[PDB]
């Protein structure tokens, strides 16, 4: 209902569109299938 700030997101947690992405989808996403990603951008 009401907006308040933005929450950076750990790179591969529930939100990050990569927590679902398969291998073939990662490649198109220009992200490496080997990245562990537990970091923030």
């Amino acid at each position: 209902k009401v907006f308040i700030g933005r929450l950076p997101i750990m790179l591969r947690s529930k939100n990050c569109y990569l927590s679902e992405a398969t291998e073939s989808d990662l490649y198109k996403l220009k992200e490496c299938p080997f990245d562990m990603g537990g970091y923030f951008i």
């Binding site: 490649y27 198109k28 299938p33």
Partner: protein
């Protein structure tokens, strides 16, 4: 990143054997040791060249543009 062309230590051309090699393995179901010897790779310098190679160019290709 691609099969080295030529083995570091002596220079036996080892760039024309990647594919041959990967084939003597798959279909001919040979052990790496026998495959190598048949590709004529007798000295270990030459052997470690192919055996140890990781063909990354394969995942490098998988990115669209």
């Amino acid at each position: 990143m691609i099969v080295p062309v030529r083995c570091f230590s002596c220079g036996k051309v080892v760039g024309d054997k990647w594919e041959s090699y990967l084939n003597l393995l798959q279909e001919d179901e040979l052990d790496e040791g026998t495959a190598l010897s048949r590709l004529g790779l007798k000295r270990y310098c030459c052997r470690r060249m192919i055996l140890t190679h990781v063909d990354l160019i394969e995942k490098f290709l998988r990115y669209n543009p």
